[PDB]
Amino acid sequence: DFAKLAAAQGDAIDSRYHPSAAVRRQLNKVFPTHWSFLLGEIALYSFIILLLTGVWLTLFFDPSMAHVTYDGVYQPLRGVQMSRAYETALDISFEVRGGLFVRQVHHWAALMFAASIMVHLARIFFTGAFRRPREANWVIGSLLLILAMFEGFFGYSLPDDLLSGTGIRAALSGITMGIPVIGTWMHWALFGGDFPGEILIPRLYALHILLIPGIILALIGAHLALVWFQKHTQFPGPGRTETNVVGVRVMPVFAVKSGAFFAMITGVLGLMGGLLTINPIWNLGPYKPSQVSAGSQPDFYMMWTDGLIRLWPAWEFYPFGHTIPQGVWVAVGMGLVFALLIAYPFIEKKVTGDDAHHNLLQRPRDVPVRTAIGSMAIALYLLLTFACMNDIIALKFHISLNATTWIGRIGMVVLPAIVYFVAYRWAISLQRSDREVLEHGVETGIIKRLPHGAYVELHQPLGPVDEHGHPIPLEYAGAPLPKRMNKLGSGGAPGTGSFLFPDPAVEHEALTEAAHASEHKSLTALKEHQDRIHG
């Protein structure tokens, strides 16, 4: 009697505790059903998969520089001195059932985590979800992005590899020693000595499996709690206002679709871990200061920092008996990048004057200057990433390596400007298109007038039509406009039988008019609620 068991368990729960009101509030919480609001969930799900795979990895990983000869199964690396970290990474890859798959899905989850964090940041920035109520949310999310970047750095640096080791040597060691007053001291504190200090990988292992994941988990908890209680913002729409949330309740629909989305994201990541090879360390010999490779790139989320290193033009200053190497330039650049990213909402409000409580998102077209600035920043980030990749770009796409370096150097001040101008004008022209639709109706096929030979596109008005043909223009309300009669009530009733065979006409008619009734009922309910809010 599962129904009786459920009832008895509910009564016992509500007697021991009293979660009825709280649970009802959680279940009844309404979440907007916009697709772009799942971008953060992608990052959350990738993070969960990262935790689950990282536990498995830590069950088999040994962090240490203790030198050992492999003497494993992988023949191409036998008798070669390597760190125990590399040896156990190879053991995970080869000598544990499914360890290669687990580590590959872990790395793919890391890449998807960074990518989805970037996409979510783009969504919120361009939609203006950081304004008065949620600047703190933006700030903690920026800290979260920085932590994710650096944890991925430490994660692919954990198995001491040739690629990851040379990346560490460059970024960490060089840029740390570069810092003027405390650079060498920071280097010695972090590595416990010179660069190959025998505590580096244990320290990174701790930072990567316990410390940084703990901070990220706490910050994700704060992030999700803030989103939960500062009810999720929404785009302007029929019944959507600054003081309501139009969407679906948590329990019946949102919970089911979020769980299913998590399942599908897990499936995508597992499929990638299977079919796509990620970081094949066995091809990469154990780290040695002398051995190198041509590629020498970090993961894509640090590729922009590496590209900054490459592109910045070797400007070194030599104060009285001292040196200020080119690494400090990039250190300051990264500092500026993070500072501006964290402080943008406050910069935005200082610049514009907006101190209003904003609960309705802005369309990126509707906010041109911010959209232009975001496009400019994305262009700069892409230029830096492809500059880091300039080695492989030059190799495959036959471009001189010097040519790619200087393309990056010039474009990091030219391409941002071009993209800013283009994005600003593009946003304004999207606004112009929206107003054209508002004032003339949707466009359709052309018709030749009866008496004379005029051609008229035979538009379709979206609002009340004047006594004559031309309609009364509507007022823009911040919501997208249907520019195709495709997406309106036109040409949308295929035979509802099946792909290969029809259904009885009675069934088809019943279904089609039932759907018509349901959709017009939804439209009428939204219209009535909209009229009720002010009217």
Ligand X SMILES: CCCCCCCCCCCCCCCCCC(=O)OC[C@H](COP(=O)([O-])OCC(O)COP(=O)([O-])OC[C@@H](COC(=O)CCCCCCCCCCCCCCCCC)OC(=O)CCCCCCCCCCCCCCCCC)OC(=O)CCCCCCCCCCCCCCCCC
Ligand Y SMILES: CC(C)=CCC/C(C)=C\CC/C(C)=C/CC/C(C)=C/CC/C(C)=C/CC/C(C)=C/CC/C(C)=C/CC/C(C)=C/CC/C(C)=C\CC1=C(C)C(=O)c2ccccc2C1=O
Ligand Z SMILES: CCCCCCCC/C=C\CCCCCCCC(=O)OC[C@H](COP(=O)(O)OCCN)OC(=O)CCCCCCCCCCCCCCC
The annotation places the binding site at: 40, 103, 106, 120, 123, 208, 223, 232-233, 279
The contact set with a copy of itself (CB under 8 A) reads 15-17, 55, 58-64, 66, 68, 84, 88, 132-136, 198-199, 202-203, 206, 209-211, 213, 226, 229-230, 357
CB 80 within 8 A of CB 288: no
Q: Select 260 or 332, whichever has its Cβ closest to ligand Y.
A: 260
CB of 357 to ligand HEM, least distance (A): 13
The pair of structure tokens assigned to 13 is 């729960």
CA distance 354 to 348: 8
CA distance 417 to 371: 13
> Is residue 340 a contact residue for ligand Z (CB under 6 A)?
yes
DSSP label at 31? Answer: E
The contact set with ligand HEM (CB under 6 A) reads 37, 39-41, 43-44, 47, 50-51, 54-55, 57-58, 61, 89, 92, 103, 106-107, 110, 113, 117, 120-121, 124, 129-130, 134, 137-138, 141-142, 144-145, 148, 151-152, 155-156, 158-159, 208-210, 213, 216, 220, 223, 227, 232-233, 279
CA distance 145 to 484: 38
* Alpha-carbon distances, residue 502 vs 491, 499, 512 (angstroms): 18, 8, 14
Task: Estimate the crossing angle of helix 401-440 against helix 300-311, to 10 degrees.
Answer: 120
Q: Select 351 or 510, whichever has its Cβ closest to ligand Z.
A: 351
Q: Position 416: which residue type?
A: P
Strand pairing partners for 317?
Answer: 324
Give residue number: closest CB to ligand X: 221
Number of residues that bind ligand 9XX (CB under 6 A): 7
The pair of structure tokens assigned to 392 is 């492989």
Residue matched to tokens 């505790």: 17
Q: Select 65 or 89, whichever has its Cβ closest to ligand Y.
A: 89
CA angle 503/504/510 to nearest 5° reads: 100
> Is residue 30 a contact residue for ligand Y (CB under 6 A)?
no
Which of 67, 350, 484, 520 lies at the binding interface for ligand Z (CB under 6 A)?
Answer: 350
> Is residue 332 a contact residue for ligand Y (CB under 6 A)?
no
The contact set with ligand X (CB under 6 A) reads 13, 16-19, 21-23, 25-26, 136, 217-218, 220-222, 224-226, 228-230
Q: What is the dihedral of CA 126, 132, 136, 137, to 10 degrees?
A: -50
89 binds, among ligand X, ligand HEM, a copy of itself, none (CB under 5 to 8 A by kind): ligand HEM
Kindly give, in sequence order, each residue whose CB lies less than 8 Å from that of residue 339, ignoring residues fewer than 6 positions away. Answer: none
CB of 180 to a copy of itself, least distance (A): 25
Strand pairing partners for 172?
Answer: none
The pair of structure tokens assigned to 304 is 């922009």
Quick one: which of 511, 465, 525, 462 has its CA closest to 490?
A: 462
18 binds, among ligand X, ligand Z, ligand Y, none (CB under 5 to 8 A by kind): ligand X
Measured over the CA atoms of residue 73, residue 78, residue 84 and residue 89, the dihedral's sign is: negative
CB 147 within 8 A of CB 219: yes
Which of 377, 407, 419, 442 lies at the binding interface for ligand Z (CB under 6 A)?
Answer: 377
Stretch that binds ligand 9XX, among 182-190, 254-262, 306-314, 324-332 (CB under 6 A): 324-332
For the chain, the maximum distance between any two Cα atoms, rounded to a whole number of angstroms, is 94
CB of 23 to ligand X, least distance (A): 5
CB of 43 to ligand HEM, least distance (A): 4
CA distance 33 to 249: 10
CA distance 100 to 73: 14
CB of 140 to ligand X, least distance (A): 8
The pair of structure tokens assigned to 363 is 């369309």
377 binds, among a copy of itself, ligand Y, ligand HEM, none (CB under 5 to 8 A by kind): ligand Y
> Is residue 351 a contact residue for ligand Z (CB under 6 A)?
yes
Task: Estimate the crossing angle of helix 212-229 against helix 135-157, to 10 degrees.
Answer: 150
19 binds, among ligand HEM, ligand Y, ligand X, none (CB under 5 to 8 A by kind): ligand X
CB of 347 to ligand Y, least distance (A): 8
SS3 state at 54: helix
Residue matched to tokens 């990052």: 43
The site for ligand Y (CB under 6 A) is made up of 41, 49, 52-53, 56, 98, 101-102, 105, 118-119, 121-122, 125, 145, 224, 227-228, 255-256, 258-260, 262-263, 266, 300, 303-304, 337, 340-341, 344, 373-374, 377-378, 380-383, 385-387, 389-390, 392-393, 396-397, 399, 404, 407-408
Which residues of the shown chain bind ligand 9XX in the complex (CB under 6 A)?
A: 317-319, 324, 328-329, 332
